Amino acid sequence: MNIFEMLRIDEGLRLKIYKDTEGYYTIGIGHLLTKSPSLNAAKSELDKAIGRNCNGVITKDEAEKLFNQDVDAAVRGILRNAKLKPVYDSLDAVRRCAAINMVFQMGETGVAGFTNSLRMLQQKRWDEAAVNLAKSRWYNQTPNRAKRVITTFRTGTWDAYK
Ligand SMILES: Cc1cccc(I)c1
Ligand SMILES: [Cl-]
């Protein structure tokens, strides 16, 4: 297991524009295109991202390329964020994958309310952090995926993905 395999499990792979769990146009391995309700707006974002006129469809290679860019962007966003970087750097590699997973799903803004969870994670109070992480819209709206991520933070193992 690694972050790519983890997120590939959580996000799936679809080569045509689809709607994510929130109803937003997405493609590939969970690549958000737009929050606009306009399919044309999503198609424009797709063409811009791939560099050709795709009319809503990409290849597996293209999906994997976008996915690598998106994982890297999540990592570099963590490293540039004064709140997230100290916690991230305190974690082991398996738990760092759980952190990337959350940033990939929700962005830096979506994790802004996790201040108390971040403190518990930095303190290595794993069961306490796991309880706190579940008290969230995130957990309630995507409970099976949140449970896997939370188990990863709780245990520092890949058990939830095996
Ligand atoms: C709980 C959490 C989420 C995103 C990033 C980090 I570091 C920690
Ligand atoms: Cl879920």
Side-chain angles (χ1 to χ4, degrees):
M1 286 294 305
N2 59 56
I3 183 57
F4 295 95
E5 293 186 14
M6 185 198 203
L7 277 164
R8 170 64 180 81
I9 288 165
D10 285 334
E11 298 291 344
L13 169 66
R14 301 177 72 175
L15 302 180
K16 309 176 189 309
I17 293 177
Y18 63 99
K19 290 179 177 184
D20 74 4
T21 63
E22 301 286 350
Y24 296 136
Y25 291 122
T26 302
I27 200 164
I29 306 167
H31 181 83
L32 175 65
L33 290 167
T34 181
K35 299 188 178 180
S36 167
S38 167
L39 180 57
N40 285 337
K43 286 174 171 181
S44 292
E45 290 303 299
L46 179 59
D47 292 351
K48 175 164 57 79
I50 304 295
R52 67 181 179 86
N53 293 329
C54 298
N55 196 43
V57 177
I58 62 176
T59 68
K60 184 173 183 176
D61 283 355
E62 288 167 345
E64 290 173 341
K65 183 184 172 71
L66 289 186
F67 182 46
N68 196 153
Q69 292 176 351
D70 291 344
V71 171
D72 287 343
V75 172
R76 300 299 295 275
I78 289 164
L79 297 178
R80 68 177 180 88
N81 185 292
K83 300 182 177 185
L84 298 178
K85 181 184 185 182
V87 181
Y88 185 79
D89 283 349
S90 81
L91 295 172
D92 58 276
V94 178
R95 294 186 172 93
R96 293 194 300 260
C97 289
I100 297 162
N101 192 306
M102 292 187 73
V103 172
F104 189 103
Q105 186 180 359
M106 282 174 285
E108 301 176 46
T109 66
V111 304
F114 287 80
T115 305
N116 301 317
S117 312
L118 290 169
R119 181 180 65 255
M120 296 177 195
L121 291 169
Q122 180 143 15
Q123 295 171 317
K124 304 192 178 297
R125 294 175 182 199
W126 306 125
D127 285 14
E128 294 89 347
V131 167
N132 187 263
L133 284 162
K135 294 171 182 174
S136 60
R137 178 180 188 276
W138 170 58
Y139 174 93
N140 284 100
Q141 302 301 134
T142 54
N144 282 342
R145 196 252 186 84
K147 282 171 186 178
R148 290 192 289 277
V149 173
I150 291 170
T151 291
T152 308
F153 275 128
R154 184 176 56 82
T155 68
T157 75
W158 289 114
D159 287 357
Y161 290 85
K162 301 295 186 176

